[PDB]
Amino acid sequence: NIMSSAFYQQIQQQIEEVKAEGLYKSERIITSQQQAAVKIASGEEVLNFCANNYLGLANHPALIEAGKAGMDEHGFGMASVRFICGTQDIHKELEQKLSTFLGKEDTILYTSCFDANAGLFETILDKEDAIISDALNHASIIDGVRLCKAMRFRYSNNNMTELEEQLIAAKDAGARNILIVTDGVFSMDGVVANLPAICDLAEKYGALTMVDDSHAVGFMGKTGAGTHEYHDVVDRIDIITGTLGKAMGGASGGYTSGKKEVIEWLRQRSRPYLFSNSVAPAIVSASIRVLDLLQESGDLRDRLWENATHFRTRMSEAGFTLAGADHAIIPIMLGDAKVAAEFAERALEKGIYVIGFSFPVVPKGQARIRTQMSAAHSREQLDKAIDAFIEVGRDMEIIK
Amino acid sequence: NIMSSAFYQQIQQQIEEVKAEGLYKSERIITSQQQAAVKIASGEEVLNFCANNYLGLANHPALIEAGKAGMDEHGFGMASVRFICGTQDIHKELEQKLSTFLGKEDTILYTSCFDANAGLFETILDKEDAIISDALNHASIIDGVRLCKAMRFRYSNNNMTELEEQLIAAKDAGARNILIVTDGVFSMDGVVANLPAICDLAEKYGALTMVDDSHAVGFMGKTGAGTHEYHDVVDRIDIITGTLGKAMGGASGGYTSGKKEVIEWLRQRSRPYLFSNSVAPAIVSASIRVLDLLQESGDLRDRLWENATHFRTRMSEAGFTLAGADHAIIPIMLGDAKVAAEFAERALEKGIYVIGFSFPVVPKGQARIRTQMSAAHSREQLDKAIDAFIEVGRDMEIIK
């Protein structure tokens, strides 16, 4: 417009500062499908070690055929919200299937877990209530709590002592309902949350439990229901949120599961559910097929855990410092941010695709490179990757 | 448990209160594809007049086959965000295609327009800035503004005088940047916003303009770019948000379009873009096919507008009071809430699916039934609908 010139100038300045601080996120164009071997625009094939394709279902032919079948049987889109004319039979079918898979009474579907978390806390909790969140919760949970008028309390990561202290402070504040929100798996450390201690403190202080099993559902546990099956704390965890964009396929969608009263109140008052388009029939059909496929074979889970144990053993032997325990997310702790950036660059030169993270996302100087295992990797590709990692670590004067 | 029971009991009380006021939203299961004739679980075929399938693309065979082609070429899902390893070539292709279709420099894709509005205001405007919103903006815009630390200003619907007053109050308040947010089409009145007067006031007071063309893109305008093409105010509107869940297919997805600096800053800082899964390849391929198909024939637009003119003329003759102008949304103004509910029930008995709206969404007593035209309706089905509507109006002592 007129004054716009100054406005965009400020934005450009900010962008340039982001480039100066070394935090500019650049997207790498992919020309192939989502699998273990990915083709970039430069023509090179690289081994992908930074995708949430834990079970390799993002290119599974059964899911592709189920999506085609869904598009032929129920159409491409709904072009309406759920309560008007966007609810098909496959939606309720997937909801019942998810409720039985997770062991809850009912579920409600969103187009993403971001909107599932955003539309939960404000719909349930008033000013009288209180929310107690782990300090390292996901950004969607943080924004959803920001939309909630409840009393807000945080406790440092996995510090059950601070959790009990904040519970006491919540009771003293006169809180009606108290909700404890936590990720099932902290997506930057590869550590599973201490669910038994949380449930015990909840029963001690009479509080509700919410778990975000986005990085857990599909393979964590005996049936892969999530971390609530990992610690055997089903029926003690009240609300469970999750996504389909991780192990459960990798397309899109989210869900919230709990007793029918909460789910009805969500269908009546959750703003993303009322003012956003319904879930596409292809994704719903593919997710139903995902649930069936996970009921048919635990082979992919065993492959993933074998890959994880092999990676952890071979990388711990070579002198690398690894974090986390008992999960497909294995971070390589590097310390300095520039070291993490150079490690990612060099590993890309050797044909391995990884991503490092520094200050605004993880503390300084605890810079790390988050490698993510996958059931699509074979020990040929795994060993090629691990060898490349050890080569880069030796070249950078890291491991000796 | 115990406190769980009390919590769910209070929730049940709230649900029962919602049922007492006659505001319980119930979902009707659909067994057929999304088209003009929809089959419910009771076996009946009904004519749908409450879906945003303006061009009938929700069941278009070209989009279904293009989605199958996309799933075969680029997979089912990405299982990663855009800046990690979720950006394919088709994503950037669709972004450039949309930027040229809308006449903007660049676009950015989200999994829904809800997240597009939620991730815009907080990313751009600080406390130094100010936002001036139409009092009747969509819920997604409201939630996005709620996340912004800027000064908040409202002006009554289409009241350019109050808009100028709030612009003056914002300049006097010392606002650095001022942004005027508005829907292109108000989805409850069928009225297009007074974009020329808004642009004139913005140029007078040096303010940015944002338009949410969700109910406009695809058919409003000469090429269907949106209401900014309707009023010929491209380059005068700075930012445009929109969805693909309406005329552009009806599946899911959203976008924000503007100058390249803003889109870069969004790719670097928009929280839903950084912490939510990328758009599925099927939807992206189908949207590219949508843009091509809309550039290949203006037949669907002509069918939609012919249906709209026929409906408005024949319903205005029969004595009905219709609102709106120059849009596929035609509200039948009924006044009383019980009248709107009974009209919807009776029209459902006649085999027509419509939805009425009363107090918390539209003023009392301005109850209305929002009929939405579609290029999938044929004059056979359209005339059957209008006959049913006139029958209901005669039975209810409304029209005489």
Side-chain angles (χ1 to χ4, degrees), chain A residues 75-317:
Chain A
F76 169 67
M78 295 309 302
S80 175
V81 304
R82 279 282 289 269
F83 82 97
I84 292 183
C85 56
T87 305
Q88 285 181 327
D89 49 359
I90 52 177
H91 291 77
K92 291 301 168 71
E93 183 178 350
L94 179 58
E95 286 189 340
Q96 289 183 0
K97 223 175 186 63
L98 274 169
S99 61
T100 61
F101 173 75
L102 304 172
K104 309 308 294 182
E105 292 184 9
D106 198 2
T107 66
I108 174 176
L109 296 173
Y110 297 78
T111 57
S112 67
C113 189
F114 197 97
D115 310 2
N117 297 325
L120 182 67
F121 307 103
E122 183 187 3
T123 312
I124 289 180
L125 304 168
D126 299 337
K127 316 173 189 180
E128 297 299 325
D129 309 330
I131 302 179
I132 302 179
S133 310
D134 190 308
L136 223 52
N137 279 346
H138 194 263
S140 65
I141 293 186
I142 290 174
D143 293 7
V145 177
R146 287 176 58 186
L147 293 178
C148 189
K149 314 296 179 61
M151 307 174 135
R152 280 177 270 184
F153 299 96
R154 289 193 303 269
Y155 64 96
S156 59
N157 192 240
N158 274 28
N159 193 10
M160 301 298 104
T161 302
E162 276 196 25
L163 176 54
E164 183 163 25
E165 295 178 357
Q166 301 303 319
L167 282 165
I168 294 170
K171 300 292 285 188
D172 296 350
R176 182 52 182 176
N177 298 326
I178 294 173
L179 209 163
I180 301 171
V181 193
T182 178
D183 286 10
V185 173
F186 303 101
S187 68
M188 297 301 302
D189 311 78
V191 182
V192 181
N194 193 5
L195 293 186
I198 293 173
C199 294
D200 294 357
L201 285 173
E203 293 183 354
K204 185 191 302 179
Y205 289 80
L208 309 164
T209 305
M210 168 185 168
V211 169
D212 192 340
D213 266 353
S214 297
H215 281 256
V217 68
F219 55 93
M220 293 296 296
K222 301 175 181 178
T223 64
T227 53
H228 62 325
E229 188 185 25
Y230 185 42
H231 295 292
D232 192 7
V233 287
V234 194
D235 303 353
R236 299 186 67 189
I237 291 173
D238 304 63
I239 305 178
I240 290 180
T241 55
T243 178
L244 308 175
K246 261 60 171 177
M248 306 292 292
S252 73
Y255 58 87
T256 301
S257 63
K259 284 197 176 182
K260 198 171 183 180
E261 305 85 321
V262 175
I263 309 300
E264 287 181 354
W265 189 244
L266 292 180
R267 297 182 206 278
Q268 296 297 325
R269 287 290 188 87
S270 181
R271 292 165 71 82
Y273 190 73
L274 303 174
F275 305 108
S276 189
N277 203 36
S278 176
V279 190
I283 313 301
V284 175
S285 298
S287 304
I288 296 173
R289 187 57 183 166
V290 167
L291 290 171
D292 282 330
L293 178 59
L294 297 184
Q295 292 177 343
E296 291 179 354
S297 65
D299 304 337
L300 293 177
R301 290 184 284 274
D302 295 337
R303 287 196 55 193
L304 174 62
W305 289 102
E306 287 182 357
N307 291 346
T309 53
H310 184 65
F311 185 85
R312 193 174 290 268
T313 301
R314 263 203 69 182
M315 296 290 287
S316 182
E317 287 188 353

Side-chain angles (χ1 to χ4, degrees), chain B residues 154-276:
Chain B
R154 291 194 305 269
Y155 65 97
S156 59
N157 192 239
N158 274 28
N159 193 316
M160 301 298 104
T161 301
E162 276 196 25
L163 176 54
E164 184 163 25
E165 295 178 357
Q166 302 303 320
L167 283 165
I168 294 170
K171 301 293 285 188
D172 296 350
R176 187 160 211 92
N177 297 325
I178 295 173
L179 209 162
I180 301 171
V181 194
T182 177
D183 286 10
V185 173
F186 302 100
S187 69
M188 297 299 302
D189 312 79
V191 182
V192 181
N194 192 5
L195 293 185
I198 294 173
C199 295
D200 294 357
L201 286 173
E203 294 182 354
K204 184 191 301 180
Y205 292 94
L208 308 163
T209 305
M210 167 186 167
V211 168
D212 191 339
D213 267 354
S214 297
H215 280 256
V217 69
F219 57 93
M220 293 295 295
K222 303 173 182 177
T223 63
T227 52
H228 64 326
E229 187 185 25
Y230 184 80
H231 295 291
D232 193 7
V233 286
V234 195
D235 301 353
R236 300 186 67 189
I237 289 173
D238 305 63
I239 306 178
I240 290 181
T241 56
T243 178
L244 309 175
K246 262 61 170 178
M248 306 292 293
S252 74
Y255 57 87
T256 301
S257 63
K259 284 197 176 182
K260 200 169 184 179
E261 306 87 322
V262 177
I263 308 300
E264 287 181 354
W265 188 244
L266 293 181
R267 298 182 206 278
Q268 296 296 325
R269 288 289 189 86
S270 181
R271 291 164 70 82
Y273 188 72
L274 303 174
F275 304 110
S276 190

